[PDB]
Design a protein around this ligand. Structure first.
Ligand SMILES: Nc1ncnc2c1ncn2[C@@H]1O[C@H](COP(=O)(O)OP(=O)(O)O)[C@@H](O)[C@H]1O
Ligand SMILES: [Mg+2]
Ligand SMILES: [Mg+2]
Ligand SMILES: [Mg+2]
Ligand SMILES: [Mg+2]
Length: 271
């Protein structure tokens, strides 16, 4: 089973760009609008599996279409009839670049200034989203890309364990502060090279989000300041009331640190 060369007589697929647990993402030429796009298609090896097919459809009707320089646009959704059966897809803005998951794996931790810049730009995407009534819900390294021209692109908004917030783990209500906490997880990882919590199972990692304090970034990797510790650990506070309340507030503290000014986050002491 493979993915077809064309979808709906309009998209002509080229190189495979990436994959995840459900989907493959291909560069395509949109023959109708003369545009390069990324087409996210249900995985060919999973496309006949009812659980994955239905999940793909349930998620496509919720994938948020937002218009912002820092957010991957969603152009359309569709489904191709192949000789093996229906193959649903979503057409979106193509990013020529790498995900943060790619970068941390291949290059290790980013310099702190660069991590700060990238996460600060991600805050602006989240801020825009929240203002528009959309919680991201799945902020994680594979959902943030840096393009070949160094622009930050955040993607896959609005679809309801290393990056779960405590409230998601508990099945409580999730709101913008959930995104703040998950972005804190990503920040932690680009800074140290590791997510804040690892374990044998998803459930063990979820348990840690709920009950255990992260080890301060400065203890996990050299060259990280106490000021950065304070920002990261505030984003990762267990109680939503103790985090940054908005993506904008998190960004304001990141900007402070970028400019060598003291963050407003509570100080954190080690040793
Ligand atoms: N708009 C895009 N432009 C370029 N590459 C993309 C785009 N969207 C996703 N990708 C690549 O496809 C991979 C799979 O995406 P996705 O199916 O959303 O998996 P995940 O849930 O791991 O984010 C991503 O990690 C990334 O490498
Ligand atoms: Mg996937
Ligand atoms: Mg990831
Ligand atoms: Mg994704
Ligand atoms: Mg902002």
């Amino acid at each position: 089973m493979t993915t077809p060369s064309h979808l709906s007589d309009r998209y002509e697929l080229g190189e495979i760009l990436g994959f995840g647990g459900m989907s493959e993402v291909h560069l395509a030429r949109d023959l109708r609008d003369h545009r390069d796009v990324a087409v996210k298609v249900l995985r060919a090896d999973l496309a006949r599996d009812p659980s994955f097919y239905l999940r793909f459809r349930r998620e496509a009707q919720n994938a948020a279409a937002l218009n912002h320089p820092a957010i991957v646009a969603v152009y359309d959704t569709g489904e191709a009839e192949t000789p093996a059966g229906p193959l649903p897809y979503i057409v979106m803005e193509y990013v020529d670049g790498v995900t943060l998951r790619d970068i941390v794996h291949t290059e290790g931790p980013m310099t702190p200034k660069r991590a700060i810049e990238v996460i600060a730009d991600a805050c602006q995407a989240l801020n825009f989203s929240h203002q528009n009534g959309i919680i991201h819900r799945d902020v994680k390294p594979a959902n943030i890309m840096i393009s070949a021209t160094n622009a930050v692109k955040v993607m896959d908004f609005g679809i309801a364990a290393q990056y779960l917030s405590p409230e998601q783990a508990r099945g409580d209500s999730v709101d913008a502060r959930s995104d703040v906490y998950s972005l804190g997880c990503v920040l932690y990882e680009v800074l140290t090279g590791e997510p804040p919590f690892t374990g044998d199972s998803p459930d063990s990692v979820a348990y840690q989000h709920v009950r255990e304090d992260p080890i301060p970034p400065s203890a996990r990797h050299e060259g990280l300041s106490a000021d950065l510790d304070a920002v990261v650990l505030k984003a990762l506070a267990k109680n939503p009331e103790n985090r940054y309340q908005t993506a904008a507030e998190m960004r304001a503290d990141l900007v402070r640190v970028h400019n060598g000014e003291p963050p407003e986050a509570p100080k954190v002491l080690t040793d």
